[PDB]
Amino acid sequence: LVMCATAFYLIENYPLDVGPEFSASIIQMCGVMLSGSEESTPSIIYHCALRGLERLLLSEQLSRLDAESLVKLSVDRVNVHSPHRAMAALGLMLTCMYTGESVIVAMERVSVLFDRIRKGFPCEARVVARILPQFLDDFFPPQDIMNKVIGEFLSNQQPYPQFMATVVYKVFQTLHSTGQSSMVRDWVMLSLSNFTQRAPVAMATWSLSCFFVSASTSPWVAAILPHVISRMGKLEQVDVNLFCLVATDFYRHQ
Amino acid sequence: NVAEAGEQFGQLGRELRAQECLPYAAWCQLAVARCQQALFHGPGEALALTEAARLFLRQERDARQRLVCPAAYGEPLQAAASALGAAVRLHLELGQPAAAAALCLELAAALRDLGQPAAAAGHFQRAAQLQLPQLPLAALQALGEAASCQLLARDYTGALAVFTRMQRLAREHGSALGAFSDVLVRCEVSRVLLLLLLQPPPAKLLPEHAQTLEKYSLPEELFLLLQSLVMATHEKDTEAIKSLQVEMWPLLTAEQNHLLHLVLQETI
């Protein structure tokens, strides 16, 4: 552990005093170790060589060919099973995109975040639902962000829409900027056609009430959503009356 | 000469333990082992390297247990696991992999004592694969001390990997006997308190995890209160879960009493 820590202190501060061939070969030795199994390289050796890799990228010293070697190793470790092992690998996918065909290659990185919701423990996927509201608003415009969310919200292989319910809420209220608040309205129309092909009858009506809340008026409809996503199943006579009130204020919102 | 050089270093190491220094009697034992590489003594060459392992782990019960020093920082903890690196490699060349795993269960009972419970998880799994061909009940007691490490190290997801490996051998070796009949009582009371703690999705829910949760939704006293606790967290019943810890506290041991505490908080 102590011997990989002084390799990182040479590449940042003192590049030229060692060879340019020596900088790119400390990157490769943390591929074999970080893509080892959960018992081949221990958890204490795992978490300490990986935190030093996102240090060197934020330093402006590495070359353009030396930086993209770190991009490939971080994709293959998000889909390992241990989430404490796989929570640290999600931090490396950000910084390469935060130091940097432009439209095309960014398609592959975004769909890696959506699968950790599907496969992955609920101690892991609390982290993934706080980022992805804020994450999509920065990179690529909201006409492209809107297609991947709902089609991966409505799917039968969604283990719980409960933590996926908080993702969709924070998107629309940043889309309630004055330029794009009317473009909020067009996406509400297409998703209603998808419900007519049915989920189970208790389950299908719950997902309708969470959507119109996030696209509604400001003062009081928006605060209902943690009361809605509290009861996910378990239909009630009190549950039937709540669906009627929400989607009619949207009829006078048009 | 070189035979007579080894007998001189043995008289020096014993007059120092009564003098009670012990990094230097610990340095006296590593001189006996460097001669027997010039000759070839074999299983007696590994006897000089593991009496130097007993003497660097006694310098650090006087630095982190008896004399708890904030300036103690593991120079005889780095010294303890390096004389045991040359010891395990020399049993395998002679071909006794059952003696190689006796020396690695001594290195990992110190790291649970010196407060390093994540690298203690570690070296317990190295000594089992050197025993699974040979002693499958000496190999299943090195994996029950590996589940007491990761719950100190708070590795609750890596703790599901080591509990399904204990139960897959007793259906190959035990079906249960005895010694293997008490290894299976500990592993179906503690894989049920983890799947409510962390409730896995159906992609990462294995076909072995699928079988045990249909049976609930081993002693007749404790088999009845575990079917009742998988129901409440699926009903989110705050009054049901509180009266069971009051009535399951004498039943479990305090390794299984730690996994029931972390469920009642993460549902309340």
Swiss-Prot record, chain A:
Tissue and organ expression note: Expressed in the brain cortex (at protein level). Widely expressed with the highest level of expression in the brain (nerve fibers, varicosities, and nerve endings). In the brain, the regions where it can be mainly found are the cerebellar cortex, the neocortex, the striatum, and the hippocampal formation.
Covalent S-S links between cysteines: none
Domain notes for this protein: The N-terminal Gln-rich and Pro-rich domain has great conformational flexibility and is likely to exist in a fluctuating equilibrium of alpha-helical, random coil, and extended conformations.
Quaternary structure and partners: Interacts with PFN1. Interacts through its N-terminus with PRPF40A. Interacts with PQBP1. Interacts with SETD2. Interacts with SH3GLB1. Interacts with SYVN. Interacts with TPR; the interaction is inhibited by forms of Huntingtin with expanded polyglutamine stretch. Interacts with ZDHHC13 (via ANK repeats). Interacts with ZDHHC17 (via ANK repeats). Interacts with F8A1/F8A2/F8A3. Found in a complex with F8A1/F8A2/F8A3, HTT and RAB5A; mediates the recruitment of HTT by RAB5A.
Family of this protein: Belongs to the huntingtin family.
Linked pathology: Huntington disease: A neurodegenerative disorder characterized by involuntary movements (chorea), general motor impairment, psychiatric disorders and dementia. Onset of the disease occurs usually in the third or fourth decade of life. Onset and clinical course depend on the degree of poly-Gln repeat expansion, longer expansions resulting in earlier onset and more severe clinical manifestations. Neuropathology of Huntington disease displays a distinctive pattern with loss of neurons, especially in the caudate and putamen.
Name recorded for this polypeptide: Huntingtin
Source organism: Homo sapiens
Recorded name of the encoding gene: HTT
Shown segment, full-protein numbering: 2830 to 3102 of 3142
UniProtKB/Swiss-Prot annotation, chain B:
Keyword Cytoplasm: yes
GO BP terms: negative regulation of proteasomal protein catabolic process; vesicle cytoskeletal trafficking
Disulfide bonds: none
Range of residues in the leader sequence: none
Cellular location(s): Cytoplasm; Nucleus; Early endosome; Nucleus, Nuclear body
GO cellular component, one term: nuclear body
InterPro entries: F8A, TPR-like_helical_dom_sf
Chief location category: cytoplasm
Disease per UniProt entry: Up-regulated in brain tissue from patients affected by Huntington's disease (at protein level). In a Huntington's disease mouse model overexpression of F8A1/F8A2/F8A3 impairs proteasome activity leading to the accumulation of mutant HTT and causes defective mitochondrial functions.
Protein's job: RAB5A effector molecule that is involved in vesicular trafficking of early endosomes. Mediates the recruitment of HTT by RAB5A onto early endosomes. The HTT-F8A1/F8A2/F8A3-RAB5A complex stimulates early endosomal interaction with actin filaments and inhibits interaction with microtubules, leading to the reduction of endosome motility.
Protein name: 40-kDa huntingtin-associated protein
Native source species: Homo sapiens (Human)
Encoding gene, per UniProt annotation: F8A1
